[PDB]
Each structure stands twice: as C-alpha cells, then as structure tokens.
C-alpha cells in the first residue's frame, strides 16, 4: 500500500524521483538550529549551533532465510458474474460461464469437476516479490561488500562483518547471485486433464526473448555468497511454469537490463488482473530492503540469529480457465490499482518508504521491550488485541503494520488479511540472554560493558551479555508527532539540577528521569560527563553514540537502584560549537529550542543529493 | 525559481536585459547620500557626505568538485561559449590590504594560465538511435530530426569535465553516462564538432518541451545560481571559507512514450523559470549575486535565505599569506613574530568572520551590522537617501545594454476550481 | 564592538571612556589604555583609597 507508507514521511520532506545510490551505507537525517542556554546564580551562558545533524545509519546487509508457507487465496481479479451476493465462488455459475465460452466441448465436464480445487489457488505474491528483487539487483549492482570491514565501532568495543556473517566471501551485488533458469513450457489448449502442482499464467500476445530469461530466474533458488538484503536465501518456487500464450514462447536470451523487468511485471499484472497480489509483494520488500546499523554496541542482539521470511507458495490456475478473467473484474476497494501505478511512475521512492517502516518498527520495539509480563498489553499479547480481522497466523506484515499503527496513532486498513513477509519480534519473545561477539580496542572496556572477562588485553575476541534489548534506532522521521518521555524528542525541554555551595561540585541524582535529561542536554552542549553508580560501582558515559547525539537510559546496561554520583570538576569540552561550564555554584537550569528543519542525506562521508522531477 | 530570486533584489533597482562581462572580477554597490548631525558637551556640528560608494567584490574563481544533471551541464556549456574570453593569470592578486597579500598560486595549486574556452577540451559520448521494436542507459524524446549541432552538445554535456584553470562554471564533474538513446522518428545526423552559444538555447528549448521536464530545469537553474560566482573576501581572515574544496542521470520517456501525453500532472506556475531564462539569459548573474550574498551574510551570525528575508520559502584554519610590510605580525595573528618583506608565512583563524556586507539586502531587516537608513548612536544622527546602483569592472564603469525587462509571471489558477492543498 | 575587531576598541568620546575605566576597577580588572595621537599610557589603578 503506497498510500499508508507515504503518510509516514515528514511534512518538510519534499522527495524527487531519482536517487543515485553508490554505496552500502546511507546516513539519512535532518539539519536543525539548536539555541542552548545555561542559567546559574552567577549568570547566563548562551550558545547556538546553526547546523546540527541528527542521523540514523542504514545499510544494505542483513541475514534473512525464506520458507514456503500456506496462505489464504486472493479472489480479486476473477469476473464479477460467478460471485454470489455474500462474495464467494457460487459453483453452478462457473459451469454456466465455461459452457457459454470458446472452450473445447469434450473438456467442459472434466475441467468443471477440477474447478472446486483449482479456482482457490490464486496467490502470485512470491513471483512478484522475486521479480522486484531482480529489478534492484541490476539497478544498484555496483555496490560492494568487504569481508574485513567495520560493522560497528564506538571507540571502546569494535564489531567486524566476519563476526556476525561467517561463510561470507567479499564480492559485488551483481557478482553475488548465479541464478539457474527454470523451464517455461507452452500450455497446449487441448490437454485432457489439468496438471495440479504446476502453475499456469496468462500473457498478452508473444512472450519476448528477455521475458523468458526473467520468469526463468524469478522461479529459481537464490544461493548468495555475500549477505545482501535484496539477495537473501529463497527456496525454489516451482520446477516448471506453463504460459497460455497462443503466440509461441521465444527461447531464453541470457542477458537483460533493469528496464526489461518493469516490462515483464506490467504485462503479468494486466493479463492476470493481480493488483492486490502486487500490493502484498510491495509491503513485503519494504520490510526487507534495508536493515539498520545498531545505535549502540549492545544493540546488535536483534541481528545475531537469522529472521525467517514467510513467502506464500506459488499457485495460479488462470492458464486452464481463460474465460473466467475478463475486463469486468471483482474488487473490494475502489483504489486497488494505486500501488502498481505509484511504483511504475517512481521506482526509487521504495527506498524512502522502506526506511520509514523499519524506523517506525524498531522505535516501538524499543519501548515495548521495557514493559513487565504481568500486564494487559505486554510483550506476548500486543498483536492479538490490535488485530480486528481473521488472519491464518499473527506473523509477517500483521506484526509490522500493528507497530506502525501504535507509532503514528492511526487505523491501518488492508483489503485481505494476508500474513506474509519478515517477522522481527524473534529475539524479544525468546526472553533469554544473547551472547554478541566483540573485538576490544582499549584495556579498560569491561567496567562500561557487561563483559564475560574482567581483564582483557587489546585485540582479544570477547563476549558481551545483553539481557534487555536497547533501542536499535532513534526517532528522526517520526520526531515530535507522538512524543514519549523515554526518548524525550520534544522541540522545547528544560532540567533543574539543585546544588548548594557547601557541596564541592558533587551532585547525587536520586531521580532517574531528570538524570537522563541532564546527561543528554550536556552532550548537545559538547561536554563529556562520566557518572559512577554508588550501589553497584559501575560507570556510564553520555558519549555512547556518534549519530543521534542523545543519551537514552538503556545506556546504563543495568536495572537496579538509582544513585548516580556526577563530579562537576571532571567535565571535559570534546566537540566544537559548545557552551563552557568553568565552575558552577548554586542551582543550574539547562534548556534548548529546535526552530527549523531541512532534510539531508550522507554517503561515503559526502552529501547525497536528490535529482529528477 | 525566478520569482523567488527576483524578489531578493532591492525595490529601486530594475536591471536591463544584456550585460557584457569582460573580466573575472565585478564590483556592485550603490551611490547613497548621508546627512550626519553631531552633538556633544562642547557644542553642535552639522555636515553632509554628497556621494558615498558602498560595494562588495564578486569573482568567477572557486574550487569545486562533483534530468537535472543533464540541464546543469547544458547551462554551463552556454556560459563557457558566451563569456569565453575571461583570462586567469596565476601570478595575480586575490586579496590586497597593504600589510598582507594572497596570490592565486596560493589557494589554487595545480593550476596554469588559460582562457575559459581554452580550459576544457571535452570528449563526446555515443548518441545512438533507439529503433522502435526493441522489447543503466537513459532514453529521451525529441521534436523531428536531431540537428548536426544538437548531437555535439548532448555528446559533450554527458562527458567528463577536467579543467586546467580554477573557474566556477568549469568545475570538475564525473561522467554522467556512456550512451544516451534518442527516440527520434527521423534518424540523427553525425556530430559536427563546432557549435555557437545560440545553438545551445535551441537544444535546451526542444529537450524540455518534448520530455515535459520543466521542474527538472528549475532545480538546475537554482543549482547553478549557487556555483556561478564566488565572493572576494572582505578581510584576509575571510579566505578560510574557500581553502577546502566544497562538494557539488536516469529517464524512461524514450522507451514508453505513452506515459508522456497532452495532459501532464503538475504548482500552476511550473513553466515560469524556463520562460524567464529563454527571454533574459544574462539575468542569472544578478540572481546568483543576490543568493550568495544572502548566504554568506547570515553565516556571519542555502534556501539561510529564509533567515535573511524573514519569509516562508516553498579546528583553527591555516590561511597562507605573503608579507608586504615589515610590521605585519603586530596586526595579524602570524606564526613567525619576526618577518621580512617577501617571506611567505601563515596566519591563524579560529572564528570565521563575515565574507560579505549587506548591499542588495540593506535595511530589509536590521541586526545590531547596524545597516539602518536612520539611526541615533549614543550623539550622531544620520539619514541615508538617493540610492542608485552602479557596477565597476577592471577599474572602469560597467554599463548595462539592451532594453527594459518586461514582467513574465502566471497566476495561482489557470482554470482550476478548488485548491487541493496537497 | 563588532566581532571583526579582535578585542581592540577606540573611544572617540571622553565621557564614556572615564565611566568604562572606573566601573572596570570596581570589578577588579587592571586596564592599561594607550593614546594614539601623543603615544602616552594611562592606568585605571592610580589610587588605593576611593
């Protein structure tokens, strides 16, 4: 659905058609003007950063694995005459329709008997999904993946691509896949009895030399070398595929450009009258196009084990019954062609729709992981109460759309309750410890991170124990539309730290809420604060990120009693465009204001500009 | 966006069509009249400055690195041919106060002496014909037969730009494409090799009309307004901006011409920017000066223009310097505290000073710059009247030629009933 | 003063020069001005009583 994914984009964001991606990493964000202020008994110290960049790093890598599952049939496309008043295939009008057609008279009785099974095999979502992936593989084919590259680095802990993805050879996206071609046979109209477990599709005129090569590779096994997101592992959809084209199928060309795949899709949707099937395939790819680079080192727990993609079995019986498809189809919603028409016009807009969906999900799974099991709407039972339909199983797109509904705070409506796509909530529902690997840089690491060893020499491969999952992304596109006090994504905010002159700079934060706001605003002002917990004896640093530049409370990496000693004569000025706290006395009052917003994107440490219409 | 950048010019100034630029440096300002009145404890004194010239200096020198991208290069080819007699000398002055001096050897190493036409030697990309029947190469529509001259322009527009002299409209750009299909019913002619600046206008006007790429042109027009000219710094410290080099094609109309028909989807003022350029090409110079002034003024405190006008639009740096007088270390924050006339030293800049003073945007909104018309400083009370724009080029007056610019502009509605806000 | 000036201020008026130099001494700051015409020097710390 192009419509609902379009509304997620910000108001200030004015997108153009073409986006020239030339790398496997993009820093999308915005430039804002922050007017910071520090008030005290001595006096006020004002600062102003005219261009402050808040970013979320998004990559084209992510381990996924496809499995063939059984899903509901999509009945949109068939002629409106055969349907009854309620909206189900009234068999008796089918026998009437086949009799008054251009069919062979000896086949009518034998074909009508099979109709009861074959007419309820209508799901082309798997074919459109694979054909969409072939379009983007050939378009952005020049992107590279290096084996010994930096997946994450925060100074203390480093995580390489070798650690997360073993069995991985370095290669370009174009050179990753070597797809073998499936047989595309021509359907004989004078066949005695239809062959079930072999799908037959319709076509307009002659199947071109390039269309054979595309359909051949779409219905085949994806066995990748490099762990790319649009070239993940998929099983063999089918062995043979019939095509009811009176004009003969030309033999396989071998080569094709990305423009020839658009030609193949537009003919297939038009002939078969399968627009709702395409809408399902569009939302499936929107989830699994780009995966987020983790915000913190301990936020890599989401991407350790491979999340399963639910691809519905390829099943189509239009080739055997050409009469039942015509120019007057049955459809539920009137705006049923909108998703295809949007893609044909603006193909590259899917990148913006993809980041909008994953940013909406991973933000909400951040503040869903921080609720106790003893509650009404909790970790296990947040999907059931929200869903007001009849899906086969609460997985795939249902779990991702219900998280978007919670974020925006609106009612999302689909025509068919289809349950296909990636399932994200895997590591959450397990509710166990996850062991992420890390290579150390400094020697004073295991004070900050909950490491397995207490003394570790530099260049050693260690393990961090992550219990509660921290947020993987910070809200940027959904900034101050449905604000919560956890993220604290306000335009205006203030904090009042109360100290007396008798105290020699040392302040104890009994409250957890205002400790988070103090540590966050001090980082906007470019000050490196290092607090120490009095009960446990661990340490936390506000500089625990190089993208957003905010401090979330999950950076403590421990749930206990709140007694944070901060010494305010060890505050160090780190960044440029900063206000100085030389020597405070009395009550401190910090405050900021974000005034205007301008969309900005970065790639290879250079500006990435939007071009076209 | 013509109507946006046209608004930035002052209400009194209305420039003429043509402007014969014959140098790499242009002063622009106004001749105002100041009526001062002084009062203190000793007594009162009244005077009057009859003619006072307040001006900035803007140049065609700026180190930069690289259907909107195609129109961008086609526009750059137009101005290379038109103003293709501007000389860049390597051992010339960039800034000169009296104590310090910056040469063009410094700020621009890896440069030689060349004219603007002699800077680029562009190769030609293959312009092939798309035969109808074929079932990372763009295809564009065309009206009738592709002319012998039109081929050479499209060929050079797609090719790599590799300059010798640092020029603003000849900056380094990567190769757009290798091939470019043209769905022309009549076959294309082979490339001639030579073309006039007038022939590039004919190429742009046809390419936009056929493809209906009016909004793509508007993007390229604004994109060139930033690059076209660069500021000459106000003081020696304001050279810190221009040390590090600032960083600056797909179409499927040829394949599927059914998608582009007689009823296109569009603002109702979506053909104004092209209609403005095709009528008055030399007006871009004034729009460019207006834009780069607004940006570099507000950075002292791109679409910075909103912060300037106040309307809704829809590490220490090591500057290399030359010592002219022996007493230079007293004024500038120099590394070597003892110097000799001729020595090349380096000065330190921590906070970036303003590169330009408000001239066109003088008194539209006054900050405490203190660019008032009337002000009482505490006692000095002055009044500014009788503004008249004047431009100087190569220490002589540069006069505007041609006729008076008549307004072209379309209303918010043609025959549209309801404003579907969108 | 403007940011273009690197701390250096010239007092054309004699009245406000006297008030600046006096209030800076209440604040406990040792200012040393130099006359441009003659080339002599004046210090605000020229008394230990008032």
For residue A208, what are the CA distances in angstroms to A31, A136, A265, A528? 49, 21, 13, 64
DSSP per-residue string spanning B325-373: STTHHHHS-BS-SS--TT-EEEEEESSPPPS---STTSSSS-------S
Q: What is the rounded distance in angstroms from the CA atom of residue B214 to the CA atom of residue B68?
A: 10
Contact call for A606 and B247, based on CB within 8 A:
yes
In degrees and rounded to multiples of 5, residue B124 shows phi and psi of -125, 125
Q: What is the DSSP letter of A426?
A: T
DSSP per-residue string spanning C7-31: S------SHHHHHHHHHHHHTT---
Burial category of C50 from C-beta neighbours within 10 Å (exposed 0-12, middle 13-18, buried 19 and up): exposed
Q: B263: helix, coil or strand?
A: coil
Mention every residue, 6+ apart, whose C-beta is less than 8 A from residue A551: A516, A519, A520, A523, A542, A544
CA-nearest residue to B313 within chain A is A12
Q: A383: helix, coil or strand?
A: helix
Q: Contact, B215 vs B270, CB < 8 A?
A: yes
Candidates B292, B397, B306, B410; CA nearest to B27 is: B397
Burial category of A113 from C-beta neighbours within 10 Å (exposed 0-12, middle 13-18, buried 19 and up): exposed
Beta bridge partners of C34: C41
Q: Record the tokens describing residue A331, joined without a space.
A: 């459809």
Contact call for C13 and B40, based on CB within 8 A:
yes
For residue A452, what are the CA distances in angstroms to A152, A301, B163? 20, 16, 58
Q: Record the tokens describing residue A561, joined without a space.
A: 């009693």
For residue A39, what are the CA distances in angstroms to A43, A45, A416, A498, A529? 6, 7, 57, 12, 18
Beta bridge partners of A202: A244
Q: What is the rounded distance in angstroms from the CA atom of residue A127 to the CA atom of residue A313?
A: 9
Q: How far is CA C5 from the centre of its chain?
A: 16
Please give the sequence-ordered ranges of beta strands (E in DSSP) within A279-338, or none if there are none: 291-292, 307-312, 315-316
Q: What is the rounded distance in angstroms from the CA atom of residue A357 to the CA atom of residue A401?
A: 9
Q: Contact, A440 vs A157, CB < 8 A?
A: yes
* Number of neighbouring beta carbons within 10 Å of residue B113: 14
Helix (H) or strand (E) holding B100: strand B100-103
Q: Contact, B107 vs B242, CB < 8 A?
A: yes
Q: Record the tokens describing residue B207, joined without a space.
A: 């390419």
Q: Contact, A192 vs A108, CB < 8 A?
A: no
Q: B289: helix, coil or strand?
A: helix
Q: What is the rounded distance in angstroms from the CA atom of residue B142 to the CA atom of residue B213?
A: 12
Candidates A128, A278, A118, A268; CA nearest to A202 is: A268
Q: Contact, B66 vs B161, CB < 8 A?
A: yes
How big is the CA angle at A469 (ends A465 and A473), to the nearest 5 degrees?
125
Q: What is the DSSP letter of B282?
A: G
C-alpha R_g of chain A:
28
* Number of neighbouring beta carbons within 10 Å of residue A183: 11
How many angstroms separate the first and last alpha carbons of chain B? 20
Candidates A509, A520, A543, A501; CA nearest to A591 is: A520
Kindly state whether B233 is in contact with chain C, defined as any CB-CB distance less than 8 angstroms: no
Q: Contact, A363 vs A473, CB < 8 A?
A: yes
Helix (H) or strand (E) holding A286: helix A276-287
Candidates A306, A346, A271, A286; CA nearest to A16 is: A346
Q: What is the rounded distance in angstroms from the CA atom of residue B115 to the CA atom of residue B385?
A: 42
Contact call for B137 and A210, based on CB within 8 A:
no
Q: A51: helix, coil or strand?
A: strand
Q: What is the rounded distance in angstroms from the CA atom of residue B32 to the CA atom of residue B52?
A: 6
Q: What is the rounded distance in angstroms from the CA atom of residue A592 to the CA atom of residue B415?
A: 47
Q: What is the rounded distance in angstroms from the CA atom of residue B254 to the CA atom of residue B185?
A: 11
Q: Contact, B258 vs A345, CB < 8 A?
A: no
Contact call for B353 and C13, based on CB within 8 A:
no
Tokens 């993009």, located at residue: A26
Q: What is the rounded distance in angstroms from the CA atom of residue A427 to the CA atom of residue A379?
A: 11
Contact call for B333 and C6, based on CB within 8 A:
yes
For residues C1-30, one letter each, b for 16 or more C-beta atoms within 10 angstroms of the residue's C-beta and e for the rest, the string is eeeeeeeeeeeeeeeeeeeebeeebeeeee
Resolution of this deposited model, Å: 16.0
DSSP per-residue string spanning B141-193: E-SSS--HHHHHHHHHHHSPB--SS--GGG-BB----SB-EEE-SSPPPPP-S
Helix orientation angle between A125-139 and A209-218, rounded to the nearest 10 degrees: 110
For residues B280-310, one letter each, b for 16 or more C-beta atoms within 10 angstroms of the residue's C-beta and e for the rest, the string is bbbbbbbbbbbbbbbbbbbbbeeebbebbbe
Q: What is the rounded distance in angstroms from the CA atom of residue A237 to the CA atom of residue B286?
A: 62
Contact call for B136 and A210, based on CB within 8 A:
no
Q: Record the tokens describing residue B36, joined without a space.
A: 């001062």
DSSP per-residue string spanning A8-33: TS-SS----SB----SSEEEEEEEEE
CA-nearest residue to A577 within chain B is B351
For residues B195-210, one letter each, b for 16 or more C-beta atoms within 10 angstroms of the residue's C-beta and e for the rest, the string is beeebbeebbebbbeb
In degrees and rounded to multiples of 5, residue B224 shows phi and psi of -85, -30
Q: Contact, B204 vs B221, CB < 8 A?
A: no
Q: How far is CA C23 from the centre of its chain?
A: 10
In degrees and rounded to multiples of 5, residue A525 shows phi and psi of -75, -5
Candidates A204, A199, A174; CA nearest to A185 is: A199
Q: B37: helix, coil or strand?
A: strand
Candidates A221, A226, A215; CA nearest to A161 is: A226
Q: What is the rounded distance in angstroms from the CA atom of residue A230 to the CA atom of residue A286?
A: 11
Contact call for A611 and B68, based on CB within 8 A:
yes
- The number of residues making up chain B comes to 422
Q: Contact, B185 vs B227, CB < 8 A?
A: no
Candidates A162, A167, A258; CA nearest to A214 is: A258
For residue B215, what are the CA distances in angstroms to A359, B14, B270? 31, 26, 6
Kindly state whether B379 is in contact with chain C, defined as any CB-CB distance less than 8 angstroms: no
Q: Contact, B87 vs B72, CB < 8 A?
A: no
Strands A240-244 vs A200-202: parallel, antiparallel or unpaired: parallel
Mention every residue, 6+ apart, whose C-beta is less than 8 A from residue B141: B183, B210, B211, B253, B254, B257, B260
Residues from chain B that touch A263, judged by Cβ atoms under 8 A, are 135
Q: What is the DSSP letter of B239?
A: G
For residue A532, what are the CA distances in angstroms to A465, A537, A538? 20, 7, 6
Kindly state whether B40 is in contact with chain C, defined as any CB-CB distance less than 8 angstroms: yes
Residues from chain B that touch C15, judged by Cβ atoms under 8 A, are 41
CA-nearest residue to B332 within chain C is C6
Q: What is the rounded distance in angstroms from the CA atom of residue A60 to the CA atom of residue A230?
A: 8
CA-nearest residue to A140 within chain B is B136
Q: What is the rounded distance in angstroms from the CA atom of residue A544 to the CA atom of residue A541?
A: 6
Min Cα–Cα distance to chain B from C5, Å: 10
Candidates B320, B316, B336; CA nearest to B328 is: B336
Kindly state whether B272 is in contact with chain A, defined as any CB-CB distance less than 8 angstroms: no
* Number of neighbouring beta carbons within 10 Å of residue A52: 18
Q: What is the rounded distance in angstroms from the CA atom of residue A9 to the CA atom of residue B35?
A: 55
Q: A315: helix, coil or strand?
A: strand
In degrees and rounded to multiples of 5, residue B272 shows phi and psi of -75, -40
Q: Contact, B180 vs B128, CB < 8 A?
A: yes
Q: Contact, A250 vs A208, CB < 8 A?
A: yes
Mention every residue, 6+ apart, whose C-beta is less than 8 A from residue A54: A29, A30, A32, A474, A476, A547, A548, A549
Chains A and B touch (3+ CB pairs under 8 A): yes
Q: What is the rounded distance in angstroms from the CA atom of residue A304 to the CA atom of residue A586?
A: 48
Q: Contact, A578 vs A47, CB < 8 A?
A: yes
B vs C: CB pairs below 8 A: 8
Kindly state whether B351 is in contact with chain C, defined as any CB-CB distance less than 8 angstroms: yes
CA-nearest residue to B270 within chain A is A613
Dmax over CA atoms of chain A, in Å, equals 104
CA-nearest residue to B248 within chain A is A607
Q: Record the tokens describing residue B230, joined without a space.
A: 């660069």
Q: What is the rounded distance in angstroms from the CA atom of residue A598 to the CA atom of residue B218?
A: 19
Contact call for A16 and B247, based on CB within 8 A:
no
Q: What is the rounded distance in angstroms from the CA atom of residue A391 to the CA atom of residue A385?
A: 13
Q: What is the rounded distance in angstroms from the CA atom of residue B191 to the CA atom of residue A405?
A: 58
Q: A61: helix, coil or strand?
A: strand
Approach to solving = cryo-EM
Q: What is the DSSP letter of A470?
A: P
Tokens 């205006």, located at residue: A492
Beta bridge partners of B100: B323
* Number of neighbouring beta carbons within 10 Å of residue B43: 7
In degrees and rounded to multiples of 5, residue A361 shows phi and psi of -75, -55
Min Cα–Cα distance to chain C from B188, Å: 60
Neighbours of chain B (3+ CB pairs under 8 A): A, C
Q: Record the tokens describing residue B159, joined without a space.
A: 């090719």
Tokens 């509710």, located at residue: A431
Q: Contact, B266 vs B404, CB < 8 A?
A: no
């Amino acid at each position: 659905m192009s419509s609902l994914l379009n509304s997620l984009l910000p108001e200030y964001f004015k997108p153009k058609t073409n986006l020239n991606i030339n790398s496997s990493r993009v820093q999308y964000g915005f430039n804002a003007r922050i007017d910071m202020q520090y008030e005290d008994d001595s006096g006020t110290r004002k600062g102003s950063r005219p261009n402050a960049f808040m970013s979320n790093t998004v990559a084209f890598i992510g381990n996924y694995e496809g499995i063939i599952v059984d899903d509901i049939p999509i009945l949109d496309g068939l002629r409106a005459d055969i349907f009854d008043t309620h909206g189900d295939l009234d068999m008796g009008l089918v026998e009437d329709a086949l009799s008054k057609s251009t069919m062979i008279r000896r086949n009518v009785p034998t074909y009508t008997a099979y109709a009861s099974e074959l007419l309820y095999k209508r799901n082309l979502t798997s074919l459109f999904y694979n054909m969409l992936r072939l379009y983007y593989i050939k378009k952005w084919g020049s992107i590279k993946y290096e084996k010994d590259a930096i997946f994450y680095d925060n100074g203390h802990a480093c995580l390489l691509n070798r650690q997360l993805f073993p069995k991985s050879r370095d290669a370009s996206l174009e050179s990753s896949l070597s797809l073998p071609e499936a047989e595309i046979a021509m359907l004989d109209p004078g066949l005695e009895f239809p062959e079930e477990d072999v799908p037959a599709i319709l076509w307009h005129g002659r199947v071109s030399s390039r269309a054979t090569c595309i359909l051949g590779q779409a219905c085949s096994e994806f066995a990748p070398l490099a762990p790319f997101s649009i070239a993940h592992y998929s099983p063999q959809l089918t062995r043979k595929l019939f095509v009811n084209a009176p004009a003969g199928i030309e033999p396989s060309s071998g080569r094709y450009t990305h423009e020839d795949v658009k030609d193949a899709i537009t003919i297939l949707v038009s002939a078969n009258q399968a627009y709702t099937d395409f809408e399902a395939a569009y939302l499936m790819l929107a989830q699994t196009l780009v995966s987020p680079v983790p915000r913190t080192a301990e936020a890599s727990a989401w991407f350790i084990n491979a999340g399963m993609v639910n691809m519905p079995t390829l099943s189509c019986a239009n080739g055997y019954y050409p009469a039942l498809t015509n120019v007057n189809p049955y459809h539920r919603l009137d705006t049923w062609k909108d998703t295809l028409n949007h893609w044909v016009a603006y193909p590259d807009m899917l990148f913006y729709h993809s980041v909008a969906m994953i940013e909406s999900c991973y933000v909400e799974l951040g503040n869903v992981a921080r609720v106790s099991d003893s509650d009404a709407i909790n970790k296990y039972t947040f999907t059931e109460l929200s869903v007001q339909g009849r899906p086969v199983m609460n997985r795939g797109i249902i779990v991702d759309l219900t998280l978007v509904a919670m974020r925006t705070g609106r009612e999302i409506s689909l025509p068919y309750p289809v349950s296909c796509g990636l399932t994200r909530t895997d590591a959450l529902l397990q509710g166990t410890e996850i062991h992420v690997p890390v290579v150390v840089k400094d020697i004073d690491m295991p004070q900050y991170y909950n490491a397995i060893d207490k003394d570790v020499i530099e260049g050693q491969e260690t393990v961090i124990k992550v219990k509660q999952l921290p947020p993987a992304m910070y809200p940027i596109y959904t900034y101050g539309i449905n604000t919560t006090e956890f993220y604290s994504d306000h335009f205006e905010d203030q904090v009042q730290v109360e100290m007396a002159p008798i105290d020699n700079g040392k302040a104890v934060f009994n409250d957890a809420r205002k400790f988070s706001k103090f540590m966050s605003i001090m980082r906007m002002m470019g000050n490196d604060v290092t607090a120490t917990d009095l009960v446990t004896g661990r340490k936390v640093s506000n500089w625990a990120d190089n993208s957003s530049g905010r401090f979330l409370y999950t950076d403590v990496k421990y749930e206990g009693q709140t007694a944070f000693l901060v010494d305010m004569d060890t505050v160090k000025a780190r960044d440029h465009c900063w206000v100085s706290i030389v020597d405070p006395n009395g009550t401190m009052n910090l405050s900021y204001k974000m005034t205007n917003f301008r969309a900005a994107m970065f790639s290879r440490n250079k500006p990435l500009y939007m071009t076209g219409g």
